[PDB]
């Protein structure tokens, strides 16, 4: 190839990188209008390590809330944790859409002590609801986060149905073997808008 | 080379970029569990420029605290400043580790007025403590931040000792010639965990 070709390859490459890395709109991004429901969706793993205080006196232990799973920031610790290997999380998307794919990501191995990431979700499934609250929602896909793959992993539904949704569940069924908890860094939802 | 080779080079390149740029775990990253001690570690350069206020009435002048040196955000101003060319800073790492290398970084010249960065630290040294508070700690290395090098600079200890640590000092001995202060953007600590 010629130098000219290389620059174009790089430009294109850098451009895709700056489009939230994967280049697909995220109907689950919080700032874009997505929100977590809380009342529906798992209890946060309680730790009591991080004590924040001002002007001298202790205030409270902060612990990451479920909403960080919809927040772009994914440095180590920027995850939401829950007790054990199985867990609920439920999003109201910023718009009603036909869900075509989802994206899950974890912190890179290379940035993790001992280059292991045992608190990464393993098998998961996506349910879509079309009214909010409970009745139990349509299964849309049952995937597996590869701990030996890249950190951002996109999963395209094998032949999804045409029905549209605004509420969805992320259900983590197992993790990669951490004894105490499971950290979830960022969860993305893509689809064709109801327009 | 072939186009195929180029894409692989770029992919690999972009991948390393997204691993906190240098691809090594940072035992001094705050969100990962590192914290600053404060009582031990220098007084912040007082300025009285930035006046934040709500609903109409003045509240206080905010000034960057020492903890920003452990925070990933490194746009101009995202630094911690101190009086003159010499200064203390002390971290409790997120884990006890054998410190192998450190990383210091400053804002790029190209992003700085007159493309000079005179408030950048010059010579520094790293002390490691194994009990916290004072007795005076083991020197681990005496380095120099190159103002004409790249912005992120990694310094590998010349034959470090096998002793492990969880507390460490960053001691700035001189800077690159600013008269009033020294800004420190992000300070990183790498090593093999005590496992």
């Amino acid at each position: 190839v010629t130098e000219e070709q290389v620059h174009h390859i790089v430009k294109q490459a850098l451009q895709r990188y700056s489009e939230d890395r994967i280049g697909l709109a995220d109907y689950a991004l919080e700032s874009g209008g997505a929100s977590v429901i809380s009342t529906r969706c798992s209890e946060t793993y309680e730790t009591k390590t991080a004590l924040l205080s001002l002007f001298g006196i202790p205030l409270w232990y902060h612990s990451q809330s479920p909403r960080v799973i919809l927040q772009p920031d994914v440095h180590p610790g920027n995850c939401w944790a829950f007790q054990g290997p199985q867990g609920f999380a439920v999003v109201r998307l910023s718009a009603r859409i036909r869900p075509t794919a989802v994206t899950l990501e974890h912190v890179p191995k290379a940035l993790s002590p001992n280059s292991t990431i045992s608190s990464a979700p393993k098998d998961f499934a996506i349910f879509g609801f079309d009214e909010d609250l409970q009745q139990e929602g349509t299964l849309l896909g049952k995937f597996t986060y590869d701990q030996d793959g890249e950190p951002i992993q996109t999963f395209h539904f094998q032949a999804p149905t045409m029905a549209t949704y605004q509420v969805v569940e992320l259900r983590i069924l197992t993790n990669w073997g951490h004894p105490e908890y499971t950290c979830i860094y960022r969860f993305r939802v893509h689809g064709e808008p109801a327009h | 080379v072939t186009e195929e080779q180029v894409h692989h080079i770029v992919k690999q390149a972009l991948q390393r970029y997204s691993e906190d740029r240098i691809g090594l775990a940072d035992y001094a990253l705050e969100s990962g569990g590192a914290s600053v001690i404060s009582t031990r570690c220098s007084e912040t350069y007082e300025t009285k420029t930035a006046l934040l206020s709500l609903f109409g009435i003045p509240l206080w002048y905010h000034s960057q605290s020492p903890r920003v040196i452990l925070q990933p955000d490194v746009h101009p101003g995202n630094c911690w400043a101190f009086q003159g060319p010499q200064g203390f800073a002390v971290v409790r790492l997120s884990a006890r580790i054998r410190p192998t290398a450190v990383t210091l970084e400053h804002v790029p010249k190209a992003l700085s007025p007159n493309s000079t960065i005179s408030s950048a630290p010059k010579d520094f040294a790293i002390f490691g403590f194994d009990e916290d508070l004072q007795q005076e700690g083991t020197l681990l290395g005496k380095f120099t931040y190159d103002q004409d090098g790249e912005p992120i600079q990694t310094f590998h200890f010349q034959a470090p000792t096998m002793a492990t640590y969880q507390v460490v000092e960053l001691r700035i001995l001189t800077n690159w010639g600013h008269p009033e202060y020294t800004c420190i953007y992000r300070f990183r600590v790498h090593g093999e965990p005590a496992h």
């Binding site: 991080a50 944790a81 912190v107 | 969100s31 569990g33 914290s35």
Partner: peptide, 14 residues
């Protein structure tokens, strides 16, 4: 605001 942060126990979840 200027709140100091300290990890009394271990690391946070990762």
């Amino acid at each position: 605001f200027y709140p100091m942060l300290r990890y009394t126990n271990g690391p946070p979840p990762t």
